[PDB]
Amino acid sequence: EPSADWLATAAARGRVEEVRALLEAGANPNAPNSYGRRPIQVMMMGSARVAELLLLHGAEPNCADPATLTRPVHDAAREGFLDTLVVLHRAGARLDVRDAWGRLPVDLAEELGHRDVARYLRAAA
Amino acid sequence: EPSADWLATAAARGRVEEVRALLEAGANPNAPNSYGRRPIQVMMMGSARVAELLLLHGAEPNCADPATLTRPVHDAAREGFLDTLVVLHRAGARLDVRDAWGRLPVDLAEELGHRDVARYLRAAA
Amino acid sequence: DQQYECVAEIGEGAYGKVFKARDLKNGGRFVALKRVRVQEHPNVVRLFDVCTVSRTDRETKLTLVFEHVDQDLTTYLDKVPEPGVPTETIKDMMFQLLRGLDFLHSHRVVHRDLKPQNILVTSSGQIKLADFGLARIYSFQMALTSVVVTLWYRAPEVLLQSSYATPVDLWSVGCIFAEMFRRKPLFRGSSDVDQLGKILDVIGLPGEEDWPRDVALPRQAFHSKSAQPIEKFVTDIDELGKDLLLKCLTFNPAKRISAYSALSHPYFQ
Amino acid sequence: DQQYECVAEIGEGAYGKVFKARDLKNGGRFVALKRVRVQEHPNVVRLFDVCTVSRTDRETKLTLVFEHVDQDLTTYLDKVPEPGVPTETIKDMMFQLLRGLDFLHSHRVVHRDLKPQNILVTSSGQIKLADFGLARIYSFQMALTSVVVTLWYRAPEVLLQSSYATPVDLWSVGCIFAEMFRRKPLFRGSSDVDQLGKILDVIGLPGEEDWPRDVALPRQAFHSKSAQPIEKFVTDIDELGKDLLLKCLTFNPAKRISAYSALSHPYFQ
Numbered sequence: 001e002p003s004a005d006w007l008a009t010a011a012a013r014g015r016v017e018e019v020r021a022l023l024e025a026g027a028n029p030n031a032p033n034s035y036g037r038r039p040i041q042v043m044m045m046g047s048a049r050v051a052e053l054l055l056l057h058g059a060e061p062n063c064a065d066p067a068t069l070t071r072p073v074h075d076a077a078r079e080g081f082l083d084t085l086v087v088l089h090r091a092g093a094r095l096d097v098r099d100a101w102g103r104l105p106v107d108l109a110e111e112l113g114h115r116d117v118a119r120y121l122r123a124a125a
Numbered sequence: 126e127p128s129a130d131w132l133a134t135a136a137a138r139g140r141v142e143e144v145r146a147l148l149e150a151g152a153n154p155n156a157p158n159s160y161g162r163r164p165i166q167v168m169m170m171g172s173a174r175v176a177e178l179l180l181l182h183g184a185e186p187n188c189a190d191p192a193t194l195t196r197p198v199h200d201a202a203r204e205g206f207l208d209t210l211v212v213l214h215r216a217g218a219r220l221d222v223r224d225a226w227g228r229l230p231v232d233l234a235e236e237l238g239h240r241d242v243a244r245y246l247r248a249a250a
Numbered sequence: 251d252q253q254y255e256c257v258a259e260i261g262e263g264a265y266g267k268v269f270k271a272r273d274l275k276n277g278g279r280f281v282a283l284k285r286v287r288v289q290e291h292p293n294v295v296r297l298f299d300v301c302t303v304s305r306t307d308r309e310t311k312l313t314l315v316f317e318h319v320d321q322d323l324t325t326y327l328d329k330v331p332e333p334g335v336p337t338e339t340i341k342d343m344m345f346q347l348l349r350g351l352d353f354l355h356s357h358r359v360v361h362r363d364l365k366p367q368n369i370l371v372t373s374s375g376q377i378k379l380a381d382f383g384l385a386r387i388y389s390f391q392m393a394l395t396s397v398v399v400t401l402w403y404r405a406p407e408v409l410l411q412s413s414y415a416t417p418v419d420l421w422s423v424g425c426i427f428a429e430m431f432r433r434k435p436l437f438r439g440s441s442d443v444d445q446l447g448k449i450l451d452v453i454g455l456p457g458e459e460d461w462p463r464d465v466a467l468p469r470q471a472f473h474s475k476s477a478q479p480i481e482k483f484v485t486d487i488d489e490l491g492k493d494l495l496l497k498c499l500t501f502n503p504a505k506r507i508s509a510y511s512a513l514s515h516p517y518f519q
Numbered sequence: 520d521q522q523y524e525c526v527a528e529i530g531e532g533a534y535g536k537v538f539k540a541r542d543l544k545n546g547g548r549f550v551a552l553k554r555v556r557v558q559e560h561p562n563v564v565r566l567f568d569v570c571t572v573s574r575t576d577r578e579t580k581l582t583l584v585f586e587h588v589d590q591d592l593t594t595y596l597d598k599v600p601e602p603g604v605p606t607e608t609i610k611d612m613m614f615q616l617l618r619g620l621d622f623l624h625s626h627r628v629v630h631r632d633l634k635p636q637n638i639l640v641t642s643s644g645q646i647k648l649a650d651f652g653l654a655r656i657y658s659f660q661m662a663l664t665s666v667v668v669t670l671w672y673r674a675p676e677v678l679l680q681s682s683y684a685t686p687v688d689l690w691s692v693g694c695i696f697a698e699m700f701r702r703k704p705l706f707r708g709s710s711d712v713d714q715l716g717k718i719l720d721v722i723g724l725p726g727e728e729d730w731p732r733d734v735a736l737p738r739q740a741f742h743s744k745s746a747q748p749i750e751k752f753v754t755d756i757d758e759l760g761k762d763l764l765l766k767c768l769t770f771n772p773a774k775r776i777s778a779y780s781a782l783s784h785p786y787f788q
Contacts, residue, residue: 001444002441002443002444003394003396003440005441005443005528006396006397006440006441008527008528009527009528009529009653012526012527012528012529012539013529013530013636013651013653013655014590014591014593014594015655016594016597018655025395026393026394033527034441034443035525035526035527035528035538037526037527042526042527042539044589044590044591044594045589045590046589046590046594046598046642047590047594047597048594048598049594049597049598050594065526065541065547066524067524067541067543067547068524068541068543068547069547070541070546070547075549075589078546078548079549079588079589079590079641079642080641080642080643081589081590081642083598099546099547100547101546101547103546108546112642114642126713127710127712127713128663128665128709130259130710130712131665131666131709131710133258133259134258134259134260134384137257137258137259137260137270138260138261138367138382138384138386139321139322139324139325140386141325141328143386150664151662151663158258159710159712160256160257160258160259160269162257162258167257167258167270169320169321169322169325170320170321171320171321171325171329171373172321172325172328173325173329174325174328174329175325190257190272190278191255192255192272192274192278193255193272193274193278194278195272195277195278200280200320203277203279204280204319204320204321204372204373205372205373205374206320206321206373208329224277224278225278226277226278228277233277237373239373266680267680267735285680285735287680287681303733304733309682311681311733311734411535411536411554411556412556412580413578464572464573464580465580466536466554
């Protein structure tokens, strides 16, 4: 049985409150989501409050995305949400990891033209 | 503002648990339902557990139905749910009241052929 | 205009809303209204009237007025004295439910949402099919309150999402049937996936055939695991019941028993 | 078959389900999939692809693949530094939302469910309309937890139930617009009735004309009471804003401002 699937869509839907609740209602902050991918992997980057919520709640920030191999800090970097990136960063996720196409979140952020993230990463690394 | 409307549909939908919850979550066991008719008037006769729930929870069993003038014990009598009738009865509702067409729950029950209710009422009165 | 007075909202179906009301033309009796907008059988909740609210330049408010039985099979089963619902009666109720559900198929109709809360049990234990769309959305195991909109009677078909055929109802009749003896649902899913599994946990993973290729969750994800005996959860269920039950509670819709035929099964001997 | 890998369920729209997925053909980038079955504009979430899952004897599993912006106006507004969202930006976002919503009307399209959680705000604050059906069903005032499926952006029209016209969206844009400054919804209804009232409490009971005869709740039930000033709840909102806001947040759909014209209003000067 899952339950920590509800948590994924939560994080995914960027449902700060449900994520919290779900969590502080006894929900596993590390489980595969029936689609195999834990939240904070599937969370709404850009919902810093959510990344921050899970992270500082027993949430391993380092996770390779089964197929993709991409990691949160990557996604955060590609969508431009420095917010989630940084929270992810201070939390533990290493801002110099590669994906299946061999890419640093930096490369992603640099690529899409995310100047800001490009900075927060073209530094602190 | 209502809230005790949620309670009506609850009682109406015969949602024992929501009725309870709704109630034991601070909900008024006597309010008009935006359609003007309190639960235990709109409850699912036949959901004895619900009639019983509201009744023994601050629920005035005596109420004339705005237009109709019909009362719970009536309805309970017309649908044949002795269950709700009796709970309603022991609770307080008087089993010899009339509606707009001037009818005793008895008459209703006797009419539809509800032998049982016909008995519980053609006695104790 | 309506003579029937809206006594309370009781559900929001696709087509619109459905309230409880008192038909003022008759005893102020209770009646189900389904207010619609546009552009008989003994076991089916009768349609007392179609009140036309407003003919316009394409769109027409109506107000269907259906009969009402104030007590669902849910409160029915909830109500019965401790041993359980008597056996004779199940065969009957069960029998009625089928004859009724059959009557719908016979005219292209697929109920789809045939939960107990839609089955009505009269004062006289006379059954009537009906739909309210109300959605008695649930919460799980005391200290494990997982939300859900009660999709426990959902067929595997509709679960995996690859159809909504006539036999979808029949799977439900089975869930309900098991539940008759039960007074506790056979499969309480939270998510659409949980439920899809649960069924299998009881019934068992069918071979990669009854279960399609395209459809959402792949057969293999719910690893073959199990082939649990019916008797384990539908106790005191006699032979022919155990029989007709599985015949309704079968994975492959086309393979699963029909309404029509279900009526004929030995059980109702 | 899909190259895009379903990373997570994110909503169940009428037509079916919608998940988050990683389009494996591109960077494993995030993409919204809407799996359907049967029988461009800058401000609109693009449709990356229509994957045909299965052509059959009438019924066809597809898989539309829409672009994805990982952050809703809800988290957007939730996120901003304490004074609030900057004013320049609102006019822009607000402006974008309109131009977009307009683009839909221009082609018969009526969004209907245009909540903030459907408006996407990109990294670059570039707005995109989208729909997820997800339903972020709510609970009320801390110690007054009343449930609801967030229908706060519902137009009075659709509330009372008498239509679902092009201008239904426009009322929402107004709710959202007020909310931009706000970072707190303008009208938090619990029931379909609560919401219908709330709006009036702010806007005010229109004369028995803008409000129809047939439609569900009668005008008089929400007794004329009020005519509350906009400024009371949308503070620091400049003149032309206060203007365009009410022009969108107007009771009578046909009377309420259009998308097209809304773009032209002084405000976006």
